[PDB]
Amino acid sequence: EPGDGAQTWARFSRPPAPEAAGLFQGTFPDGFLWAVGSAAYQTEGGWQQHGKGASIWDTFTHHPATGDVASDSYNNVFRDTEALRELGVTHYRFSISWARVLPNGSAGVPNREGLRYYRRLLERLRELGVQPVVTLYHWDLPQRLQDAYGGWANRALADHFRDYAELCFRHFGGQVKYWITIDNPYVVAWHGYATGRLAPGIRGSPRLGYLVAHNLLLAHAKVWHLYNTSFRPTQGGQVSIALSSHWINPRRMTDHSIKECQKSLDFVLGWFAKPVFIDGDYPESMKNNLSSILPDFTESEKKFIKGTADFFALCFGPTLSFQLLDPHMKFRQLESPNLRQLLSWIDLEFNHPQIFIVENGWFVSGTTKRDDAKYMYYLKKFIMETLKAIKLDGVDVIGYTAWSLMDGFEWHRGYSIRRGLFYVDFLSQDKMLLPKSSALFYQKLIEKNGFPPLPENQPLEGTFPCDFAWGVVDNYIQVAAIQPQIALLQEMHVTHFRFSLDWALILPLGNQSQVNHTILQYYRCMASELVRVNITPVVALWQPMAPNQGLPRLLARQGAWENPYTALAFAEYARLCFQELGHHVKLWITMNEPYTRNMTYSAGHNLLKAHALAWHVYNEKFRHAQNGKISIALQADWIEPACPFSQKDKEVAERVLEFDIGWLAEPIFGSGDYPWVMRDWLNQRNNFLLPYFTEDEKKLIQGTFDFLALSHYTTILVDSEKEDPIKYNDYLEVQEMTDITWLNSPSQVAVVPWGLRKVLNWLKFKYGDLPMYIISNGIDDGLHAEDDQLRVYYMQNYINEALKAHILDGINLCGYFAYSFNDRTAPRFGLYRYAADQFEPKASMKHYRKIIDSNGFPGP
Question: What are the start and end residues of every segment in region (Glycosyl hydrolase-1 1)?
């Protein structure tokens, strides 16, 4: 039944749960299928070899490189199988050219040489354990069937699609269980003819496009009704139709807007799917808007085409998603590359048929050849949304396919676009195939039957170690208002309430001659009261986000940090906080997470010297009088390699890390000098301005740390190869990118439960064993109807993974902290929303309450 598909937009406009939206678990059921796709003109190549016929794409290549110099795959059977053997995929998807055996204008003499290759390939796949998913038509047309017949506009070409089908089953035998008749009819019909961007035609009114699609639709009718009358008795496989569709989201979620969106699918998906599953008639939407330029069915052929399919085959990728697609049936609507909310629409619309995706993938630029980091994570979110569909949607998905096993030609963007699973160079006479990152991920996906629970992924029971530090973070506290915090902090069971002082406000001019003691006595009273209610707060001095970098106006216009003297200026302020506020503090932070990519190198040497002078003073003059521990807090956003099995990502992983974490840590934590990798990189590229450490200065920096205040907000990726000339750092040879399969914030801040684990272990390996902290970790709001969805997963899994280091590996911990307990001082980040000039506990507050009072998961 039709019309019922309008519910899928509202059904998936409100995600029932982030766990369903994330789906970090689950496995595919027994019998689920896997295959890898390829195109006829993308990879095969050659047009006189062994008797191959000419193609329309040959003419299109001359005047809009060429498919005559493709990756030499027409007679070798071990080149692709070697890629198949590594993949180990149970099925393989490809296409057969129309002109290979019948290039004549009347289906002339078949060429046995082309048959011998495909018989060889079919026999090879059986031995390895691979079965084919073949398509008899992939955007190709014979030349001699074009000039005489004048393109797909003529009806007689549908007859030529039938006799060729008579040999498709016979020549390839009965082994081929699955079949696709025509792939992506829409782009062949409209963009193939009307716009002329594709192989045939030079220009055409939309009048030709509707007729061409109509003839192609009957071509499906021609090929099915042959199968059930001549082949199925000696068979039992299924033949289906693949339709290319793109999801559409409403602009304003309006009844007429969703009607347009529902109508929009009908011009792309319902153009052929409507009369092949449900009733054999064209959609009523076209009959209204399109007056008479759309050909209509007759009564005899309406029944001839009704229900001519067994399962729905689906298409996605760069074919018509944010790519070649006519603006007219866009209906001024946005595009979204989603599978979970499109697979449901097909299941409800067409009376619940089985689904088998035939073409799906994404593309990378032509410059990248080794690390196709873009294609890996685009591919994985696709295999996410099928698992979300089978489990959380009830739609039966029988298999999945990955596009572009081998690189080829994109038919409109030239060779500037690469998509193959295995990269082949353009300067090789042998066209040797090499493994890629995507193939490695696909290698470790089938043998695991999906994404089964893992010891790291599966939560592990544990108990919190005693004397575990706690507290919330507010580094923008405004200096009358003491009571609301302590009342809220006491309910929070805080032990070390983390905050700062806003040093710029501490000293109006940066000198001790004058100072406003009103804000100085603010901290003394609040810290002492916190001790009465059992809080020993965390103190911070300097902040990275400030117009003047936290320095007064006088101290900001004269080399704010480049001045050698301003280190002494920070030194007097160090005594200022220690001489009065040091009695009620046990845990100290001086440089609260400086940003480590914009800050100048030359002034960076100053910052490392400032801590050394500051740490010595409190140690040799105040540590004995008042006991305490003083160390530093550094930005430690984990840099995970994009491909875990790629060595090049590993070396560049430290370079961004070392300039971020090691630049302000190696002089402090390590031997006392800069990391080796950052010293060589400056020397190798003949670019250097970073000063060295003198012998007297080296001993100052080293050893001035007691604890380690790791900061971890997210887990960003690293990429060595340049992808775009805008967001790839030439100086570091590092491309920043974020995995999008993760639960992403509305501000595009990812959540990674395992990201805290690796950085926790990594810092111990370089800097030895020491009492480590986690000083900064938090997430924003999200899903603005119940703001607990992203945070019920954030803090539950982050702290659980944090204890996994203690139980499994053995990295020592002493405290865990949460960021921005309120939203007034941190937009979008708050736990207590600032609504109606009041702070209220968002339901995740109980979630954070339970773990704190219970002190970890209650063990057996």
Answer: 24-451
The continuous run of DSSP H or E covering 567 comes out as helix 566-581
Cα 22 from Cα 18, distance rounded (Å):
6
- Give the number of other CB atoms < 10 A from CB of residue 50: 15
Helices marked H in 633-724 — which ranges? 647-657, 676-684, 695-701
Measured distance CA(298)–CA(300) in Å, rounded: 6
Closest CA to 247 of 228, 265, 227: 265
CB 453 within 8 A of CB 847: no
- Taken in order 172, 174, 177, 180, the sign of the CA dihedral is positive
Enumerate residues 6+ apart whose C-beta is below 8 A from 859. 461, 462, 463
C-beta separation of 851 from 791 below 8 A? no
Give helix then strand counts, H and E, for the chain.
28, 26
Secondary structure of residue 734 in the 3-state scheme: strand
- The span from the CA of 758 to the CA of 592, in Å, is 22
CA distances from 102 to 53, 158, 723 (A): 7, 15, 42
Q: How far apart are CA 421 and CA 564, in angstroms?
A: 54
Who's near 680: CB < 8 A, 6+ residues apart?
Answer: none
Separation CA 95–CA 67 (nearest Å): 15
Alpha-carbon span 231 to 547, nearest angstrom = 77
Q: Residue 55: phi, psi to the nearest 5?
A: -120, 155
Output 14-20 pairs: Cβ under 8 A, ≥24 positions apart: 14/785, 15/783, 15/789, 16/392, 17/789, 18/743, 18/783, 18/789, 18/790, 18/792, 18/793, 19/793, 20/388, 20/392
Q: Which tokens go with 562? A: 């480049």
Task: Tell me the Ramachandran region of residue 494: left when phi exceeds 0, alpha when psi lies from -120 to 50, beta otherwise.
Answer: beta
The domain at 472-854 falls in which architecture? Alpha-Beta Barrel (3.20)
Q: Which two tokens stand for residue 343?
A: 């697979």
In this structure, what are the phi and psi dihedrals at residue 786, rounded to the nearest 5 degrees? Answer: -150, 95
* Resolution of the structure, angstroms: 3.3
Tokens representing 623 are 């540590």
Tokens found for residue 678: 């950052």
Report the CATH number of the 4-446 domain.
3.20.20.80
- Tell me if 710 sits within 8 A of 661, measured CB to CB: no
Interacting residues of 483 by C-beta distance below 8 A, sequence separation 6+? none
Q: Rounded to whole angstroms, how far apart are CA atoms 194 and 326?
A: 9
* Phi and psi torsions of 536, nearest 5°: -115, 95
CA dihedral 124, 128, 129, 134 (to 10 degrees): -40
Contact 130, 91 (CB under 8 A): yes
Residue whose tokens read 């000419």: 54
Cα 2 to Cα 41: distance, rounded to the nearest angstrom: 37
Instruction: Find the DSSP H helices in 299-449.
Output: 299-305, 340-349, 373-392, 437-446
| Antiparallel, parallel or unpaired: β 91-95 and 131-135 | parallel
| Burial category of 255 from C-beta neighbours within 10 Å (exposed 0-12, middle 13-18, buried 19 and up) | exposed
Domain range summary for the chain, segments of one domain joined by +: 4-446, 472-854
Q: Which residues pair with 142 in a beta bridge?
A: 55
Q: How was this structure determined?
A: cryo-EM
Question: In this structure, what is the dihedral angle of CA atoms 684, 686, 690, 692, given to the nearest 10 degrees?
Answer: 70
Phi-psi region of 173 (alpha: psi -120 to 50; beta: other; left: phi over 0): left
Question: Minimal CA–CA distance to 3: which of 288, 258, 252?
Answer: 258
| CB-based contacts of 700, cutoff 8 Å, min separation 6 | 609, 612, 613, 616
SS3 of residue 422 by DSSP: strand
Cβ contacts of 704 within 8 Å, gap of 6 or more: 611, 612, 615, 616, 619, 630, 631, 668
